[PDB]
Design a binder for this molecule. Sequence first.
Ligand SMILES: COP(=O)(O)[C@](C)(O)c1sc(CCOP(=O)(O)OP(=O)(O)O)c(C)[n+]1Cc1cnc(C)nc1N
Ligand SMILES: COP(=O)(O)[C@](C)(O)c1sc(CCOP(=O)(O)OP(=O)(O)O)c(C)[n+]1Cc1cnc(C)nc1N
Ligand SMILES: [Mg+2]
Ligand SMILES: [Mg+2]
Lengths: 831, 831
Amino acid sequence: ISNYINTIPVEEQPEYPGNLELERRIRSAIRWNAIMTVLRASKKDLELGGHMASFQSSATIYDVCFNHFFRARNEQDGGDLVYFQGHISPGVYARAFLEGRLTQEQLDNFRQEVHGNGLSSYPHPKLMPEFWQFPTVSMGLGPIGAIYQAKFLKYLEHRGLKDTSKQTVYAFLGDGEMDEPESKGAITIATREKLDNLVFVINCNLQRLDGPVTGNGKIINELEGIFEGAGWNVIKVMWGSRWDELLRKDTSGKLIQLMNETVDGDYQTFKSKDGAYVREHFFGKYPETAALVADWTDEQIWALNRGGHDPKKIYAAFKKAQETKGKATVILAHTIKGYGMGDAAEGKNIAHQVKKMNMDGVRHIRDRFNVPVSDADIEKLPYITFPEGSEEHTYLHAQRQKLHGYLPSRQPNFTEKLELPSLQDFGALLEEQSKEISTTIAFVRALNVMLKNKSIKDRLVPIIADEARTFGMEGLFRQIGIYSPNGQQYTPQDREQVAYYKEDEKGQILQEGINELGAGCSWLAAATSYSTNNLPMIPFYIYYSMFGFQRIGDLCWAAGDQQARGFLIGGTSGRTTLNGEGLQHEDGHSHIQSLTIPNCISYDPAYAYEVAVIMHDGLERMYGEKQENVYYYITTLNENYHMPAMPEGAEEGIRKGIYKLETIEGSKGKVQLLGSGSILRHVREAAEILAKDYGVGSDVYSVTSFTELARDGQDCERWNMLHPLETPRVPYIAQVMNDAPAVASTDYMKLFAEQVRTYVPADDYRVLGTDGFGRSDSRENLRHHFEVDASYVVVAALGELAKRGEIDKKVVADAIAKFNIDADKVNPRLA
Amino acid sequence: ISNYINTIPVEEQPEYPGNLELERRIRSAIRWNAIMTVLRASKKDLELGGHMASFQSSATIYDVCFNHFFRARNEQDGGDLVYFQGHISPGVYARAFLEGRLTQEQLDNFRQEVHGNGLSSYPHPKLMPEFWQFPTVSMGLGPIGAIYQAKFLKYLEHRGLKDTSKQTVYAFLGDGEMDEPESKGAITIATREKLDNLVFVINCNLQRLDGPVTGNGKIINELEGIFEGAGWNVIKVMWGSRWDELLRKDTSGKLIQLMNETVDGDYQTFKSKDGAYVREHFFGKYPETAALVADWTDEQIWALNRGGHDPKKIYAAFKKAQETKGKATVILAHTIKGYGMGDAAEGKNIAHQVKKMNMDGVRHIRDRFNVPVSDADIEKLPYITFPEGSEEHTYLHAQRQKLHGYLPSRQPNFTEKLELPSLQDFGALLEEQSKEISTTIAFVRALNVMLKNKSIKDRLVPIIADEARTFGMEGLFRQIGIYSPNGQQYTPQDREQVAYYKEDEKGQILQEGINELGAGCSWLAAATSYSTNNLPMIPFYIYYSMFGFQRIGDLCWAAGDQQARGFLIGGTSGRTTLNGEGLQHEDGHSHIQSLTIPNCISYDPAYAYEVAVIMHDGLERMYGEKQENVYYYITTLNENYHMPAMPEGAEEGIRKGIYKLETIEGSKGKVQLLGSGSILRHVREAAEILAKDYGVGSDVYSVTSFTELARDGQDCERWNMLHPLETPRVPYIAQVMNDAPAVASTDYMKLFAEQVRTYVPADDYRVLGTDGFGRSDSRENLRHHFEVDASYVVVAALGELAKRGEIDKKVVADAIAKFNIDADKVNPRLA
Ligand SMILES: COP(=O)(O)[C@](C)(O)c1sc(CCOP(=O)(O)OP(=O)(O)O)c(C)[n+]1Cc1cnc(C)nc1N
Ligand SMILES: COP(=O)(O)[C@](C)(O)c1sc(CCOP(=O)(O)OP(=O)(O)O)c(C)[n+]1Cc1cnc(C)nc1N
Ligand SMILES: [Mg+2]
Ligand SMILES: [Mg+2]
């Protein structure tokens, strides 16, 4: 932690390259327009929302970047990847409009998008596919997202996939946002990887939403201390040029001690008052600091500005960041929240929430920033524009043209044509297996086929969060290598034999250690590379399913917003299947969390051939000609068993979510039996017992996706309600199933199979599931405890028949005794 | 970063207090019993699992703590709160068995708990309510949890609630685990709040599961750098006592330079070779270092120990942390993964996964730690014990008794009786409200009722994540104060006004800034204080609902395991209600995530009187004589509308999940209409349209909890299936509803209401919901887009009647036209 002053002294400050006066004229119009869009929205009295005080404090920082730093997407690369602070979007819009990229009609539709021609509250690529690129409004996600983006850019360079050396990743953050564990929790990775292509820009206005971040302390110093400790290059932009003379004429070093000893709380209060206040409460603290300005006017005291508001001080920091190599840079910019809004919110605790202001307030910002709007127009909350030929218009576009154009901007589809493998290339996985394998083995095998596709082999991005040994993928390190930039500065302990720990700068797999959020962020950068850099990359992130959506659900939702196209493989899944691990490992609900995401396609395959068909279909939809903006989630298991051959013509049903595996004959009745994942074979066992011991036949179905089926049914019923005069549309599951009493069982909570109830064409539909906290035991004991094994499926099936009077209820009661079922033990959900 | 040697020099290290030789005998027995436990489990070949190499590397660190530091639960306080590393549990189980707290049968039932006399794989209070305290296996949660538990202990002391000055929080972490963002993402708070009652003990064995944490670097220095930068007191326990002579005679400074330059990957390998290897590859790097051991035998060189393995160095560290005030301490203990296991795993990349070994491997461990079991008995894998009267038994118990007993241990219920507020105490919220308010305002008013309760007023712990102004709670800052251990070291900006930003050391409100996980960890510490310190505290953590389970779900699952008893308030909930915010804010699925947690009770109330009845019921269930182990989740809204008085006698129905609001007459037909949260008033609007425009009457229901009704339903059919000869149980929802066609509509995705399909006693049950990504617009436009407003309800109900021939389908067709519904607009889920 250094003295409370600028890191870069004037003597080391490079000459500012732009026309400061002209840039202010432009900047004042962007400020004005941003405020007008929020005020107009406010006028509607529709509770639309919006912010003003935030962009006010950071506008000049962005302005200096727009005029001299931000490279836009171009012929060679995707340009600089800017993670704009979410709520300062009105200013981004204000600027795109001045640039002629947005219409006045669109600005008038700020936060009203349902009818088209409107604008999102914040950066949402799903909502504005050709404008926004990175969803940053959920605080914490932007910083770590950016860390891994820069990391991925260096990965494409090392792998010789693309020259990304001219791209800089910028994360624009709030000081309050740095409280999120995700914001600072991964900064040492930027050091390990020497990400000299990443720049963190923290707007240190000392305030968050409720009040000051740490009024009793100094966040700038705390930030400096930890980032410096993590090996980052820290640049403090504390004071503007007006302070430079006052600092040079302080031989007592008392001024510096003052600044050092003053805490955040008193600092923002200073700028919420007036010159007189600062004079007594700040400079007045010492008869030495007091003197320095005894000659200055109270108005010349108030004029002193913070570094984050001085283009000259801002530029020096960004220029320095740009030159620094070997490590990442973090710029801590000192600013005023609600800057220039005077009365309205300048340095006030309520500043964040301000979205309206009387004509007195509007007039103030007009005078304050010398906005060119006459008293005759002002009450009309007019947008300002610069006509062709004007210096403002000329300068604004020239500066952007020298930097390759305008941003943000997004390309929804990649251009190249990939020659994806055919289903036939996964042929061996479609046939009966000699050895008993698991669906996780099937996935690794499918990965290897892909690794053999000339077209995409190098575009595959296997990602692990430690746990590769659990998946039996350790042999892969030697095969394709673990990515390590300037890696392997030692000889692996594993060296001698076969599966050693091979780390190479050209290594293909991303090993992110015990860090699911970081692994997901790596997966996200890869999964959106197709748009960001017009370079399709296909990520396969396999990890313990329990630590997926449950642990990184917020990033998974942002991923959907970002239109990620990739594969999330939830390994060691199923509540009863990862039997010995217990409560915090046994996943019987990940599919419930995943169905909440609109563009995530989830599957719970039972067999190897289903995995192959599913993964093949996914590559096609996402990276084939269709370029479908969706990502996949497949749960795989760690249990081995017999893998039969795929039934002829079963492909469509597998992709849709269900197909009839077989029909067992029986003379005493007929039931329908559904199963998914690892529980399917137990449902097939119940089918044999029922036919063998009770003469009850059945239709057996493998349900590869209860969720895709429920979605289909939902779509059918929705269309039906909307087209009352049309013949009702039949949900796919109802087209496949019949009306005989049905029973389903899975390794997930009951809701997973119960979600298709409305669409099941049977009078009876009994669902068995693994509701309840997990615990350690054998797979058999867990399957009995969670009441999902063959014996429970048999009793559920007999129970439905008994009801219809097809069998005696004493027969059900005897089966319960026969199968050693304790009809009175606590509901596993409460266990 | 300091030199790569011990922080505490020998001349500064205290004299070891215990009997070293006797302590090692006991430690050797514990080591052996931990391994016999896992080995015997592997022999079962049931894929039970377990680890050995991890506890082997950290055993001595825990030993010193059990012998001289760990304070057990006592009559004055809960003692030291130890977050034991999860997978070193066999070691904690081995000690407990030696202390006679566990039986041989229980150890033999390791990881087989479904039948009652087994042991959980890891620390799970829900599974072993009287043994385990904190769930740590989900890596990263232990560290943040521990930080916020230490902060909470200081809070209880400052608030004058309880003297916790004698309790120390210990966080036992792995080094690979430190990569989780949540592991280091909140460490500066320990500095902000001067948590000198927290000790982080990081086991640096240089390896995680797949291999070394950072083979090409030095995590101990990386850890040191960032923690030191965060303001923590860092203590490095690098080398054992055998190194002292060498470091002392090393006059050239060469040994330190060498130790400083060697990277993790090489140090790891050193431990996997032998003395000759070390002599050549380590000391042999420099003529000066080479001369230091030139007179040593390879055997003597091989005996050189790592600090984390030396009791004397370990003790010196914990003793120093003990006297460090003003900040938290991190102990970085250098160890060997697979320590003493030799061949099978010592310093090997495969060490983590080792679950079994050959007789030569068991005999090696027997020799390595001088275990008293004959070469003949080893085959039997015998458990070692200390007979009463023996030195070991006496010493073992004597050390614990001096420290108040044994740990871990847990008290399931609190002992005191609180005088909870009655429901009549909330009578004001039960009457019709004067002005239109929201359910959030109802919650704030309800909180104030409790705040006037003599008994619990000061036991309340309101927690916010920098969103108090949004929830209109900024007025409480002044009323009860914002907790601030260091008081207010400045004059707030709004000081001169009411609702000024008041910070106080006696402040009740926990302001955790933009930090959901930290706020949730504070919530958890408060919500389990009843068990930990036998001091029931009742936390109400309110935040934007979208950032609840989605963002901190892993914590919420652990909270259920930890038997948390408190309230989670999801503010600004509902997809269409937080209209202007958009994609990453509009929550229409948090209830789908919340329903996955077994002991979390979820509600989505529409009216203020419902909020009151639910909170009061929650209060009595968790903190009343019942002491039920569940926590509550209640979604509240930011929309103001008319709040009617509660219908006489509706209390129980509100608690259960559904009650009939009213029935409107109509002779052209009859339907049932269900609504929840904010959409309920639109469902009522539809009931009037249906009646006055179409003559269709209806039964209107307020569904306060679809999830509780589904669970009750599942419990009925489960019980029924199990008792085929008994009187079937009737789901609660089927006791309120009838069989007329039904329509449900909520601000959540369809599944939220569809989950009760099986138990709805009606032929037709159409569900409307907010499936799909949110977008920015007015409430009216969104409710129409998400097809959930009154007009959609009318069309859904009319269509049901037309289908049954009750009405002409042309009537439905006309309605769609009359209400300006686009029957062909894209499915909101795909939009
Ligand atoms: C309704 O909008 P809002 O509350 O103003 C908004 C934009 O949603 C924000 S902005 C915000 C405060 C940000 O303050 P910072 O100091 O980081 O940034 P600034 O001072 O405004 O430059 C919080 C807590 N939240 C709420 C918030 C909380 N938690 C997460 C994870 N994301 C959020 N974004
Ligand atoms: C099946 O057991 P497991 O895989 O051995 C276990 C216990 O589940 C662990 S342990 C582990 C490695 C821990 O290595 P550390 O260096 O932190 O600890 P140690 O070296 O063993 O002392 C990982 C990645 N996981 C998996 C893991 C990953 N991510 C989270 C969030 N929690 C986990 N617990
Ligand atoms: Mg701020
Ligand atoms: Mg380790």
